[PDB]
Amino acid sequence: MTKLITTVKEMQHIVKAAKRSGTTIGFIPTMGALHDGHLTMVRESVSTNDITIVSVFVNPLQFGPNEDFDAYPRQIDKDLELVSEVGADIVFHPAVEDMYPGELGIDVKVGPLADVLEGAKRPGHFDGVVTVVNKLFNIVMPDYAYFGKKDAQQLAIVEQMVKDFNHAVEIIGIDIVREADGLAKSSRNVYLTEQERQEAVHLSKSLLLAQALYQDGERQSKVIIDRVTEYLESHISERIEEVAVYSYPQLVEQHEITGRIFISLAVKFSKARLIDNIIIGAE
Amino acid sequence: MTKLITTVKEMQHIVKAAKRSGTTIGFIPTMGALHDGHLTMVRESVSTNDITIVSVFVNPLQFGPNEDFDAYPRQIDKDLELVSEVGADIVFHPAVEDMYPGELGIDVKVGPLADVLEGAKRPGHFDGVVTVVNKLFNIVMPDYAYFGKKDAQQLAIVEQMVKDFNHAVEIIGIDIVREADGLAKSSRNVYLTEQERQEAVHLSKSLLLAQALYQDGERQSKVIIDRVTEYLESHISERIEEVAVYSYPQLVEQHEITGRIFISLAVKFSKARLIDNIIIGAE
């Protein structure tokens, strides 16, 4: 019995009334094709907030010319069903023209945090992310917004935006939800051929390896990177786009580990470009 | 009787509590050194909203190295008194470091609307304006935000930012409040020498001239501009920086008038740089 709100105007009118009353709002922004990674955040919100809102919007601004915008899975009826069973109050599913009624007269761009890793590999991608997340925060006016550590760089950037723009929103980061074999859940996994689906499991395996090496005491980035790379290269035939060690959330490449870092991966299959990571350390 | 709130943290805390209690909020952003122009907006807000918040913050981001940042009038005690007399609830007076704790990680820049008139003469100025207003809107969470048409280009840009970012804020623009002789009120008038003060009255008089020419049927921008310019040059010794006719709020230069426009002026005195304008026309 989850309500489907289709326009920005109706969504905002609902939230303004809720905000001016004492009702706490939980928000989970998504691009649809929901999986248990998304649902885990929804369940969290439903057990903590008065109302939980889930947005389903494939944001064109965060897709590059040669990426998968046209093939991105779109299944609102199912998403709506999956959300209903969790107990979420509303699913916000706006039209593209409603979100972007015309040429933007103001532009938002990410600084240094987007000059490395995914930001360097997908130029402008995060500018598109912060643009739509900023709008969604103003449309839904949540007290708590949930994001997955699956997109670690994204998380750090959204946090920076919340700080820089003074959004009265507390960001909650959830750990990576994985399939039974370890594969990090992602709507894009549907792009995987029955073969790639098997090879793709090695991203997580390689991270388990990285974790064990770190656990035993290894702190030289190059040693971990080489072991992880060597492993992947002997278990997958796809092209490995990235195997890096950066401080987190600062995003400064580390050669020797003495603080909190995240070991991230990027692998390009036929059409599915998957990513995974592990955030570890204290400082 | 007005409370002086000195930190972002406390201001947000108060605002959150206000929202929870169904409090409607009116907001008047200013750079201090208040005059009746500002007070007119405060009065309007006090008569409509449950609480009225007036921010006093000389935003360093909207001042260039060559401008008057160091001389800008600062008199919080005086501002607090004037605001108390009209019934404002709070004066938000933050530290520069509190608003900008460090290097921004996200950057906001105005598009085409800032490529002309004041935007061309003051590059970066409006980026500074939208940056701080965006922040203030998220800190104060107003239902209504008041701005003066004195800064007509600013007003159009703020409205555009409200649209693009989906801010649940209604912008209220007020007409230009003037001194008895016609001079538009401005905190920068304090920079005028006795001589320049009387000369400055001609900016408004030149606009009355422009209006009369328009009333009579003149639609050739060149004719109005030349008439206004020669009038100013024959009455004041200062440099006329700008006399222009652009569509409003579209801000497209008009050589021949067939719709709503605004005739704007910019005059540079020894220290004070004054502006004024009139908005006229149907569409």
Ligand SMILES: CC(C)(CO)[C@@H](O)C(=O)OP(=O)(O)OC[C@H]1O[C@@H](n2cnc3c(N)ncnc32)[C@H](O)[C@@H]1O
């Ligand atoms: C924020 C968006 C909606 C803005 O367009 C967009 O950039 C976006 O990310 O949408 P989307 O790709 O649909 O993912 C939405 C949220 O789900 C989280 N997520 C995805 N897979 C996960 C997993 N296996 N475990 C835990 N969390 C997971 C992401 O970190 C993100 O915050």
Ligand SMILES: CC(C)(CO)[C@@H](O)C(=O)OP(=O)(O)OC[C@H]1O[C@@H](n2cnc3c(N)ncnc32)[C@H](O)[C@@H]1O
């Ligand atoms: C919005 C700010 C605070 C962001 O830093 C800054 O750009 C700013 O504008 O500050 P400030 O110059 O102090 O002016 C604050 C508000 O007062 C309005 N105002 C000034 N003189 C007026 C007059 N004579 N009649 C009517 N309205 C008048 C302006 O248009 C502006 O919206």
